[PDB]
Amino acid sequence: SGFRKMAFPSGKVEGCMVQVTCGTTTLNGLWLDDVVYCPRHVICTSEDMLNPNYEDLLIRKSNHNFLVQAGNVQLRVIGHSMQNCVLKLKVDTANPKTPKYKFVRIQPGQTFSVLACYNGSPSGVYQCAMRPNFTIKGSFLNGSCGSVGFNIDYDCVSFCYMHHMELPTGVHAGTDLEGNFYGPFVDRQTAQAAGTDTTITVNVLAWLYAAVINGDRWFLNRFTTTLNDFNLVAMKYNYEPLTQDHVDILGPLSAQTGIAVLDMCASLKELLQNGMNGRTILGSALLEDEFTPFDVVRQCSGVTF
Amino acid sequence: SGFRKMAFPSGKVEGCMVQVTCGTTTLNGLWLDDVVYCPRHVICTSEDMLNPNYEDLLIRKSNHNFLVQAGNVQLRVIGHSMQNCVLKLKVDTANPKTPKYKFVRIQPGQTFSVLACYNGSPSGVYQCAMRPNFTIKGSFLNGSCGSVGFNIDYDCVSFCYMHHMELPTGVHAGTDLEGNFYGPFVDRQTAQAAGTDTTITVNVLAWLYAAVINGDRWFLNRFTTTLNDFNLVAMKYNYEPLTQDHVDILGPLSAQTGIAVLDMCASLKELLQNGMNGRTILGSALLEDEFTPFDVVRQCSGVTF
Numbered sequence: 001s002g003f004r005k006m007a008f009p010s011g012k013v014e015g016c017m018v019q020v021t022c023g024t025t026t027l028n029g030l031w032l033d034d035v036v037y038c039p040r041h042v043i044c045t046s047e048d049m050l051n052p053n054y055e056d057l058l059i060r061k062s063n064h065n066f067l068v069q070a071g072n073v074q075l076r077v078i079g080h081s082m083q084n085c086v087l088k089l090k091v092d093t094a095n096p097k098t099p100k101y102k103f104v105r106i107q108p109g110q111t112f113s114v115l116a117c118y119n120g121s122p123s124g125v126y127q128c129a130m131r132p133n134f135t136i137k138g139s140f141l142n143g144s145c146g147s148v149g150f151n152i153d154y155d156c157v158s159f160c161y162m163h164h165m166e167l168p169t170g171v172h173a174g175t176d177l178e179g180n181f182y183g184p185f186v187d188r189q190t191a192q193a194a195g196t197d198t199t200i201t202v203n204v205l206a207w208l209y210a211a212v213i214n215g216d217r218w219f220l221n222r223f224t225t226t227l228n229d230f231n232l233v234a235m236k237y238n239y240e241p242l243t244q245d246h247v248d249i250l251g252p253l254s255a256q257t258g259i260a261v262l263d264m265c266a267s268l269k270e271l272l273q274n275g276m277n278g279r280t281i282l283g284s285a286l287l288e289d290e291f292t293p294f295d296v297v298r299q300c301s302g303v304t305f
Numbered sequence: 306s307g308f309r310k311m312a313f314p315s316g317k318v319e320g321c322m323v324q325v326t327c328g329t330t331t332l333n334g335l336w337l338d339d340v341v342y343c344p345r346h347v348i349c350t351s352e353d354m355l356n357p358n359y360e361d362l363l364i365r366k367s368n369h370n371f372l373v374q375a376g377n378v379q380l381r382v383i384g385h386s387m388q389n390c391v392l393k394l395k396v397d398t399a400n401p402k403t404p405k406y407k408f409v410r411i412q413p414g415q416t417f418s419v420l421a422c423y424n425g426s427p428s429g430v431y432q433c434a435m436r437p438n439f440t441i442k443g444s445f446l447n448g449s450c451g452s453v454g455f456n457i458d459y460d461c462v463s464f465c466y467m468h469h470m471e472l473p474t475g476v477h478a479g480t481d482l483e484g485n486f487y488g489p490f491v492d493r494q495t496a497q498a499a500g501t502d503t504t505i506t507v508n509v510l511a512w513l514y515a516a517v518i519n520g521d522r523w524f525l526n527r528f529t530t531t532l533n534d535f536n537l538v539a540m541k542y543n544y545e546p547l548t549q550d551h552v553d554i555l556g557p558l559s560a561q562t563g564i565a566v567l568d569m570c571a572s573l574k575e576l577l578q579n580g581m582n583g584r585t586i587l588g589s590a591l592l593e594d595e596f597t598p599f600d601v602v603r604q605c606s607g608v609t610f
C-alpha cells in the first residue's frame with residue numbers, strides 16, 4: 001500500500017545525456033546512436049535570444065563550432081541540421097548506451113518523467129503532466145534546456161518532451177523530439193503567457209480509485225449520475241469534460257474496485273459541490289490530477305521495466 | 306523556477322538490483338562487488354514468517370539453495386552469512402556496474418530516494434523522508450522487499466534503507482544496509498504499530514524558504530521571535546523542537562533570501578496559530594515537511610551528480 005508521485009527509473013535516459021556548447025552558450029543534448037538532439041537556441045548569444053533568426057545564425061556555424069562532451073570525452077561533430085526548434089548534431093561515434101527508443105507526441109493530461117540536467121549531468125527526476133494549456137509544472141533553472149521527458153514501456157524509452165523555456169507563473173514549455181512546440185509558444189525571449197489551465201478530470205477519477213484501493217473511502221456516496229449531468233457540473237469548476245474514451249480507459253480500475261465509473265463521478269460531483277470539509281484523500285487536501293489511469297494501475301500493480 | 310518533489314537519478318542503483326529466490330519466496334537484492342544484500346526473510350515460507358527463527362532456517366540452507374539472477378544471468382552463490390536482518394550472499398562474479406558507494410544510517414527528518422523494484426527489476430523512483438517515528442511514507446507491494454533507499458553525492462551512492470515491511474496506516478519500515486531496523490520494529494508477521502508521528506520543523510522552514518525563492522511570499526509577516534517562544538508554540542501543534550543545529554543548517558537559505566531564520570519562524574508561528582486561510586504555498590494547501598535544507602539548496606541551485 002501507499003501512493004506516491006512516482007517517476008520512471010532514469011538510468012536508460014541518464015546514459016544518453018551530453019553537454020552541448022556553442023560559443024559560450026551551454027545546454028544539454030540527448031545522444032542516441034550517432035545523433036545529438038538539443039534546443040536550437042544553443043547557437044544564440046543572450047542578445048540573439050531577444051529576437052533570433054535561427055536559420056541565419058546556423059548558416060554561420062560549422063561542425064567544429066559545436067563542442068559536444070559525453071563525460072570526459074569530446075564527441076567529434078560531422079554534420080548538423082535544424083528540425084523545427086531542435087538541432088541535430090551528427091557525431092562520429094554511436095552512443096553504446098542507446099536504449100530501444102521512440103519519439104512520441106503526447107496529449108494533454110498524459111504524464112511523463114523529467115530528468116533535469118545541467119552541463120550534461122543529471123540532477124534529479126520528477127513526474128509531470130502535460131497540462132491542458134500545453135505547459136508543464138516543472139522545476140528548471142538556467143542551463144536546464146535540453147533536459148527531456150520520457151515514458152518507459154518494458155525496455156523502450158518513449159521520449160516526448162525536450163525543455164526550452166519558462167513562462168509567467170513559473171511554468172514550462174517545450175517541444176517534442178521533432179522540435180515542434182507543445183502549445184502556441186515560440187523560442188524567443190519576448191512576453192508570452194499560457195492560456196487558462198483546466199483540471200484533468202479523468203486523472204482525478206483515477207486518483208480517487210487509487211484512494212479507494214488504499215482504503216481511503218470516506219468520499220464514496222450512495223449515488224450514480226449520468227455522464228452528461230456530471231459534465232455540466234464539472235464545467236462550472238473548470239474541469240475538462242469526461243468523454244466515453246475516458247470512461248473506457250477507467251474500465252480496469254472500475255472493474256478492480258467494483259465501483260462503476262459513473263458512481264465515482266457522483267462522488268466527485270459531491271466533492272466539487274461541497275468541498276472536502278477539512279478532510280484529506282491520500283494525505284492531500286486538494287484533488288490531484290497528475291496521475292493517469294495507467295499510472296494508478298502500474299503503481300498499484302507493480303509493473304516493472 | 307518551479308519546485309517539485311525530486312528524486313536522485315536512479316541509474317547507479319538500477320545497475321545493482323538483482324532477484325533473489327529461495328524455494329518459492331522471491332524478492333530483490335542489491336549486488337555490490339561480489340556480495341548480494343537482501344532481507345533475511347527470503348528464506349521463509351509464508352508460515353515461517355508468522356514467528357520465524359532465522360538462525361535455524363538459515364542453518365538448513367546451503368549456497369546452492371539461493372537462486373540469484375542478474376537480468377538473464379544466474380549468479381553462482383559461493384558463501385552466505387546473516388548480518389542482523391539482512392543476508393549477504395557472496396557470489397563468484399563482481400558486479401561491473403558497482404558505483405562508488407557507502408552504507409550510511411540516516412537520522413529522522415533526512416530524505417532519500419527509493420527505487421521500488423519487483424523481481425529484481427526497477428518499477429519507479431520516489432523521494433521519501435525518515436519520519437520522526439522511524440517509518441517512511443512509501444509505496445510498496447508484495448515482492449518489493451529488498452528495494453533500497455539512497456542519496457547521491459557527486460559520484461558516490463550512500464545507501465541508507467532496505468525495505469522489509471508495511472505497518473498499519475500503510476507506512477513502511479526497514480533497515481540500514483547492516484540490517485539494523487530503523488525504529489522498534491522486527492521482521493515478523495505479528496501486530497506492530499508505529500508511535501505517533503511529528504512534523505519535521507526544520508524541513509517546513511526549508512520549504513518556506515523555497516516558496517520565497519519562487520516568489521510565493523504572502524505568508525511573510527513583519528515580526529521576529531525567540532527560538533524558545535517559537536518552540537513552545539510548535540510543541541502544541543506536534544512539531545519537532547527547532548535546535549541551534551537546525552538554525553545553523555538553515556544558514557545558507559537565510560543568507561540567500563535575506564530572511565533571518567527567527568523571522569521565518571515568526572511567519573511559521575502565525576501559519577500554525579491562524580491556518581492558511583484558504584491559500585496555498587507552492588501549490589500546496591498543507592505545510593510540507595519532506596524537503597531538507599540541502600534538498601532546497603540543491604533544487605534551487607541545480608547541483609548535479
Ligand SMILES: CC(C)(C)[C@H](NC(=O)C(F)(F)F)C(=O)N1C[C@H]2[C@@H]([C@H]1C(=O)N[C@H](C=N)C[C@@H]1CCNC1=O)C2(C)C
Binds near residue numbers: 049143165168192
Ligand atoms: C524565463 C525567461 C524569461 C529567461 C525566458 N522566457 C521567456 O522569455 C518567455 F516569456 F517567453 F517565457 C526563457 O525561458 N528563455 C529565454 C530564451 C530561452 C529560454 C531559456 O532561458 N531557457 C532555459 C534553457 N536552459 C531554461 C529556463 C531558464 C529559467 N528557467 C527555465 O526553464 C529562449 C526562449 C531562447
Ligand SMILES: CC(C)(C)[C@H](NC(=O)C(F)(F)F)C(=O)N1C[C@H]2[C@@H]([C@H]1C(=O)N[C@H](C=N)C[C@@H]1CCNC1=O)C2(C)C
Binds near residue numbers: 447469477492497
Ligand atoms: C503487511 C504485512 C501484514 C504483510 C506484514 N506486516 C506486518 O506483519 C506488520 F504488522 F508487522 F507490519 C509485512 O509487511 N510483512 C510480513 C512478513 C514480511 C513483511 C512483508 O510482507 N514484506 C514485503 C516484502 N516483499 C513488503 C510488504 C508487502 C505489502 N507491502 C509491503 O511493504 C515479514 C515481516 C517477514
